């Protein structure tokens, strides 16, 4: 689990900072840094496919033009009031990230879980009936009634 | 042979010629008879005119006879001249092994094989026993080689070098019987080197660590620890003696039988170097400097510096990026200058094989992208150039972040799994091959059935490649 | 469904193979990093350039008895190991 | 000239290991030939293996008439090329008249053996008295002279093998008829040069050998593994 | 017979590979071969063995 979270955090940061730097310009609010660098590539592990990279399905109703109200900033505009970011450098970036986390990195965790289950099963019953001793003793080390009257005991 | 000896021994003018008796029992394979009737009474020997028979025992494959002879006395360098080597390499060395040697030198060149190609060019036209051991081992004699190996001083270096030579000659893909036989003899001598060093470590550790570091007066111009690396003899380094040596050289002064959280805690607050919680076995200002010169703590300081570098690069790239470079961008440029001078230092040290590993390639490539980002950054008042510079810095931050995987390979926990990660490439490529075939076969069919004569190149690839690609994450084309 | 769950199976089989070779290849790769950190005599990293200047300082101004002793030591366990071979 | 088959190699390596384990002296000739060479080399091997912890003492006893280079001093000298052995930590050379006289060393050696035999050091398990064992494996006159001068003294504890030249006849005989019976069959080629006027003397030598057979013992054939040397001594 | 253990042995596979490559030796790398396919007059050069 820690190896999966380590690799996913590295790919998450490397994609999130690159996308936030290519799209927008000088976010000065700390909350909308972490909502768009950490949170959206995290959601892209459950098949969300980050949306503002398309430059065709990008409407300006969800922008702010300056950090005043809730919503994120726009992508920085042209002189013709057009988006500046290249589609040919953000679409394959999203494709590589989406492949590398939603498919390869999860199906590797499945393989490592399968191998660890294949190892530990003959030790499993021994460790279980070793741990059985402690609960049997700590229930036999008390001379009391059933639990809601134990305080009287 | 016994009939011919009983007729030759009972001529009564041949009892005085025990040399003829020895040559007669030499051409045949009589070992017990020669031992029982030539060297038993010990009335006659000279230990000096036993040479030609010795040379005969070298040329027609008599390992038991040369063992019996060296049991009764000879010095091999006294026996050896350069003329013996020219007879052995110019004549007794076969042309087929020469042909496979030239094929192996042309297809798989190493420093050791370049050295043996140099010395065979020398001797077809100071380390005597190693030279004869080399001749025995390339000729695949396989039993004379053990007899001379038991006489050598630098034994483990000889075994490791022989394993390297035999594996490299076993990579050759014609005459596969000779390749398999030399491969098996390579396996035998690398097993022999490992099983000898486990004994000489299991008795005494310090003299074993002295054995690992002696160059043996230019055997092949290398070390006992280096030949296992050049041969990729990774079973010799996976043994607990060499790993114990590596860990004791890795920690430095700090003892191994302490917990590491104490060590990073004493890294976190400096004047806890002078306290009784850490053992510095293998004064106080010496404790200070010998702490700060350990490999473990200079690595664990450099990784903290690297993480601080990535946080500074992210703060520059996301939140403070104006038309002119401010103070944190210049601090950032200083840190990349330090990284660049360290990388060009290790490139000047390592050589051209630095370019062999892919991580060094992408580090140099990322520094090239950074200086390209600078020269696109400084031409201000052009908005296209000032935006393209920031795009280059983002695509460089990707590389500098993906270096951290290669950085953290050293740990006892994440390490073997990160090393395991590179064994998946053929399964990933098989998945991508089949998915690309199904992707194209569906995308062109759907785009041809639905629409009619798209004349824009971008909306061909957005609807043939991109939407069936998204249909791998559960999008279901609409 | 089919093409992803086949990749899971192939990953599981490759992990089932390479694990006993994994620790050997890891502690073989450990040698290179241990050496390249021990092949430098320098301070911790942000002052290394000054130590590099110290190396620039260099560029600005410019048979053995214990060997035979330890080889003769090696020969003793060589003899003992040959005894251990033919004792088998 | 000396042949050393690997049985004798294993036995004498085990011997010098036992002598290092017990802290014993080994008295020998001490020349650069054959058996003394190999004993000195195993002394050097155990000297370089542990380097300390009750090192061994190998006294060589030579004749001074056979020595190649002789340098009289008070001041050390370098012996280079009978040749002396390198690795004996103590040497002693007997003084006499002219050069070519063997067997001169035997008198002082046997008298020294007798004095350590009659010497008493209580800190032991023998009852004091410093127990002494003689070995014989090879052939020649001096072997029989040594064994009989030893067995003439009480308690030599002579040990022989069934391997060698005279070791064969001493092992395999256990009167004059049987003496000649084994002597003509186990060594003919030396007796081809020997007059009978000292062969009757050798019959007397072996008679004084077999006078005391309880003070003699033998390492037999089928004891070929380990611990055969301790079980003999 | 579908006796696929008789063809899985290195002799028959060595025969099949030596009949598959043809004139080109087996102990060369294949990227040289496809490189000499990519540019035709590199057939006459010393980088490929035609034994």
Numbering used by the authors:
A (entry chain D): 867 to 1019
B (entry chain A): 409 to 533, 558 to 714, 722 to 917
C (entry chain A): 969 to 1030, 1045 to 1070
D (entry chain D): 154 to 227, 232 to 238, 251 to 343, 350 to 408
E (entry chain B): 663 to 713
Question: Which sentences from the paper describe this structure?
Answer:
Transient receptor potential melastatin 8 (TRPM8) channel is a Ca2+-permeable non-selective cation channel that acts as the primary cold sensor in humans. TRPM8 is also activated by ligands such as menthol, icilin, and phosphatidylinositol 4,5-bisphosphate (PIP2), and desensitized by Ca2+. MmTRPM8 is a homotetramer with dimensions of 140 × 110 × 110 Å. Each MmTRPM8 subunit contains multiple domains, including the N-terminal four TRPM homology repeats (MHR1 to MHR4), S1–S6 six transmembrane helices in a domain swap configuration, TRP helix, and C-terminal coiled-coil.
The ligand-free MmTRPM8 sample was obtained by adding 2 mM EGTA to chelate the trace amount of free Ca2+. The ligand-free state TRPM8 structure represents the full-length structure of mammalian TRPM8 channels with a canonical S4-S5 linker and the clearly resolved selectivity filter and outer pore loop. In MmTRPM8, the selectivity filter is lined by residues 912FGQ914. The backbone carbonyls of Phe912 and Gly913 along with the Gln914 side chain, build the ion conduction pathway with a minimum atom-to-atom diameter of ~9 Å between both Phe912 and Gly913 carbonyl oxygen atoms, suggesting the passage of hydrated ions during ion conduction. In the maps of MmTRPM8LMNG-ligand-free and MmTRPM8nanodisc-Ca-icilin-PIP2, but not others, sphere-shaped density peaks were clearly visible in the center of the selectivity and tentatively modeled as Na+ ions, the cation at the highest concentration in the sample. Distances between the putative Na+ and Gly913 carbonyl oxygens are ~4.5 Å, too far for direct ion coordination, supporting the passage of hydrated ions in the filter. In comparison, in the MmTRPM8 filter, the Gln914 side chain does not form a similar hydrogen bond with Gly913 carbonyl from its neighboring subunit and the atom-to-atom diameter is 1 Å larger than that in MmTRPM4. As Ca2+ has a larger hydration radius than K+ and Na+, the different filter diameters between MmTRPM8LMNG-ligand-free and MmTRPM4 may partially account for their difference in ion selectivity. In comparison, no density is observed at an equivalent site in the structure of MmTRPM8LMNG-ligand-free. The previously reported structure features in bird TRPM8 structures in the ligand-free state, such as low-resolution pore helix, invisible selectivity filter and outer pore loop, and one single straight helix formed by S4-S5 linker and S5, are not observed in the MmTRPM8 structure in the ligand-free state.
